[PDB]
Amino acid sequence: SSHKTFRIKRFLAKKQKQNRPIPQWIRMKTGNKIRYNSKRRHWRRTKLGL
Amino acid sequence: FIVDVKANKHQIKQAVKKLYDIDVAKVNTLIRPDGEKKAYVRLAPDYDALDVANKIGII
């Protein structure tokens, strides 16, 4: 909005940190079932806890 | 710098002075959209920033 509270800004920050894709060294771990992050949120489609 | 989010400019100023034996003109904080309070810290004109920068490691 460009007029944020601090509460909201911090919320957004964490959401922004969560988006990154898996580190590829994770795929090489021993008992690995994970191939892709599957919790990736694109701003244009799917619109936050808000 | 990156600074702890709870800090006042007063605290930062006092920290910067304490750690690096330095002295500050002014501190000028903001908050990164990421979460880490950044701090621009103007040193007083008796001091050169590149000289301290070399002391602390960065360049």
Next chain:
Amino acid sequence: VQRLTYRRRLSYNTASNKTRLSRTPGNRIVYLYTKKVGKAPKSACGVCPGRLRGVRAVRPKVLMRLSKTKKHVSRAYGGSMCAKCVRDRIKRAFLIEEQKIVVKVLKAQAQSQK
């Protein structure tokens, strides 16, 4: 023609968001935001509709800054009340007290008579 934008995040044209055009030394017309128009104080009498003389009509929280002389005038009831209403108050307050004395005299004569 150079059109222009507001300089603050207040979009709406309001009592708060009033402006004026100014040419800078950079030779660009720029909005400057303008200070509200202060009023001279009206009289303590309350009948004289005209506002007071010799007072800097300025937004009241400024008065703080101003010198005493700007804020008033050298008279009894100075910068609170218009002259006319003082010199009527004066002679009223005098003439009233002269009649009160006359009634006191007529009372005292009536006591001495009875």
Next chain:
RNA sequence: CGACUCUUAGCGGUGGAUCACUCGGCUCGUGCGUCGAUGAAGAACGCAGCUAGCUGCGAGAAUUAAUGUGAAUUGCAGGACACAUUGAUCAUCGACACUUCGAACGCACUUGCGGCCCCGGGUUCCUCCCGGGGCUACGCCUGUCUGAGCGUCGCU
């Protein structure tokens, strides 16, 4: 013969049935039967050398101490350590620690405003200013102190 269409079979696709597995469930039973103002449950935000999620933890943050164990952890790095030494790594968990909201407690929910005591810079108690610390919810009980009343008396 030609193309096309139909039928059957071979092989290949599509699709994920079937079968075989099962660190999950469902049911029945046994023992114990423990949360919280010494701040619960729940929420938030953090924390990894490279880590997004799940988990694990709290600015001592994938954990500290202790005790037991006795050479690993390991995706890659890097390292440590003398594994003839409190000693890697797990387990236990009695010591320590435990950010912010939350019954949630100075008052407010902006993360905004405060008061009062002490400490360091600031002064040289000069109050300011900055930083730190400790108090500052409501209700209620036992006492304590200060009181109020043409409430009931006594003495003056």
Next chain:
RNA sequence: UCUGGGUCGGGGUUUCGUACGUAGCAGAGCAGCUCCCUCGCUGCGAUCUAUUGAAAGUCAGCCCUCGACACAAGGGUUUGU
């Protein structure tokens, strides 16, 4: 190779209605300058006359050229009593 069809050009046909430019003693008036001459000279000025049935278009699905220019046995797939 009835030497050919094509592009450009030229005629014809036809549509519209007389181009630009130049000239004019045409032009309601006005102005500047003077030789204040008012037909003085010079300029502005819709429009008008002449050059001028002019200009412009006319196969793209109009007609004739045999003028100019190139280009014209070339390619691919077929099929048998």
Next chain:
RNA sequence: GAAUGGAUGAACGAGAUUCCCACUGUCCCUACCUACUAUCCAGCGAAACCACAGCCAAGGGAACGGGCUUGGCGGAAUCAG
């Protein structure tokens, strides 16, 4: 049929009628033109619907058949409508 209001009424109405003047392709009676489609192509590419299917006449039949009976008949694969 009389404030279940009766009778009226200038102004007003995207309100309901009727006629006249004008005007018109509304019509007699249709025609031509333009643009975007539809069309063919490259690329891309859905859906509803679907017992099996899909030429008729008559008959009977749950009294209007694609299928049955008796007749007519029947020729790949398709395109635009």
Next chain:
RNA sequence: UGGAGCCGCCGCAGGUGCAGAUCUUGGUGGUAGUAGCAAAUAUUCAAACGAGAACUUUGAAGGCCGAAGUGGAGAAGGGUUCCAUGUGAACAGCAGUUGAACAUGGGUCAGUCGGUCCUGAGAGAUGGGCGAGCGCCGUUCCGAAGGGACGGGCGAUGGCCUCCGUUGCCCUCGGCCGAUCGAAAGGGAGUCGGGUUCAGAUCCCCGAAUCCGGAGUGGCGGAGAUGGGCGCCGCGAGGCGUCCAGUGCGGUAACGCGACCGAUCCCGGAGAAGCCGGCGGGAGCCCCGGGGAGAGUUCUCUUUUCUUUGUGAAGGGCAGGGCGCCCUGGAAUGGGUUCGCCCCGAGAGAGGGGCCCGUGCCUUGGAAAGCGUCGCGGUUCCGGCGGCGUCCGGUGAGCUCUCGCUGGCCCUUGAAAAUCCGGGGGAGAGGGUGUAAAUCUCGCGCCGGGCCGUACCCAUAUCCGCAGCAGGUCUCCAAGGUGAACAGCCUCUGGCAUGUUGGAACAAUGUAGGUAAGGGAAGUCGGCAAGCCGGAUCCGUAACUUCGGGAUAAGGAUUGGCUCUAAGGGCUGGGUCGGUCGCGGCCGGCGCCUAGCAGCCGACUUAGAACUGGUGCGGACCAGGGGAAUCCGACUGUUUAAUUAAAACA
């Protein structure tokens, strides 16, 4: 084929056998390479990159949005979409060398811009009451609802216990009014110019400011305030002794001057006010005439056409506005005067002043900075460095904003509070003749201002409508032409690539436009649809009527281009003759345009006339078809979001 378990018999047990349930879950066809990728005028040429170009980028051309924008900025909402580099799998309904995709990194800086404080409609604890109860009501009502202050006293400590603080106690005084919450558009002190980034700037840098708080010991000046008397001594300037005065002064007045003590208490003001009209002043922009600097045009013409031609805040000065301020004075033959009014013995005109605003000029700022040009320095890096210039005037029912005055409307009268000041009072305090307490302090000096927001989009692609959806979604700015005009049409500034594709054809059906001989509603439920009409000026205007209307009634005429005419305004000027003093002044006498005349400027309209054209002329754009009657409802208003706008409701 597969690669790890499985069956026969005798008994027992059951979630035990499918074609159907518009059955459930998953998958797959035909339909079909079909429908379809048609709203909003538009693309073309060359080059670059590149494996590859209809689509990227650059250049050139042709087009559109046409300042009520397809431009430039916000609010809400989004939440990293912003910027850069790289990728070409998927996604962006063709493609893509591209993107808001994907992957790497970057990126939001404040005492002054906002939150923050205030109160609004309202919300909501306590006390009190209700309530089986979680609770509810209630917000001044069934409250002992103030913890503060001043001055005095007494005690205690901390300090050069000096003097002052700090606290404890005692007295003294004190109405409130409800704790609290409630506005990124209300109220609310104080920041502006230039530069700077791939992306941030009133936030960074440079420079100029500014407010608020503190400032003790008071950092400094200045004010308070340094008179007057008497007595001596000294030639005199003066020196001493001693007596009083001194909480500033000026103006007839409006009121003024840099400061000019002062408590609880009281009064007042400011904050703090609707809409509409008219008129005036000030800016921004437009316009015109010229100066320059650079342009384009130049076949002919054009002293050309085009661009560009600056000064922040804060101070000081001065115009220019306004005054319902004062003094003089006394107005009928009544005057003054506005576009309109409106004012006058409760004081008009006339003269002189006082105050307020001064966003306008000048100046400090400030030319050093910016812009425009010409020119160099540097392979480079370089915010390099120089020249020149940044001028003078005029216009206005012009538009935008604004300040101001003055009306009109109301059975409408148009916010509170925080905060800030003024005045009345006079409890106190000050030192004793060089100083004091005092500065709603004057000028200077010192120190501080924390916390959170700050990227970008803001919409025919960052929001909501399942999507890059023809929908929806609050504002600011707002050029030239034509014209009544923010109408439409064309243009510059800025912006785009025709709205999720291209190519070739030009059949039928359509959708959207047009045109039609003769007739003119014969069509049809019905003139539905389209057509006529349309602007302006000049005439001319009926029935009826609530006398206001009807009314653009109806019905007529004119309209172009060109060349002329007439009519509408401002400014300035005579005090000439004589004298004398320095073309200018001062004095005295004539003159006295008192029918005014002379020179110099400048918008724009209106009427009339000539001539002229293939009768065309509101040439596009814009832009009423009328008439007679009936029914209903007086009217304006409202209504079924998405089939009913009416005669229904009001």
Next chain:
RNA sequence: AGGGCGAAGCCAGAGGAAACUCUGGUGGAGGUCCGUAGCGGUCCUGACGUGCAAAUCGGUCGUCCGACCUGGGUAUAGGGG
């Protein structure tokens, strides 16, 4: 936006013996008219109708100083608003 109509009040002139009346101005009233933005939504029973759209589009329309339009805040909640 821009136009139209031109209510009270005001001025002058003319008449009138008075009462007052006429003529020309000025003035700018109004849930006044036209008409933009805005708000709406009449008709084409137009387009669309597996849409652009789970109500949109085009022209044509109503209204456009007032019972006007509109952001944010705030109040009213289900036999309730």
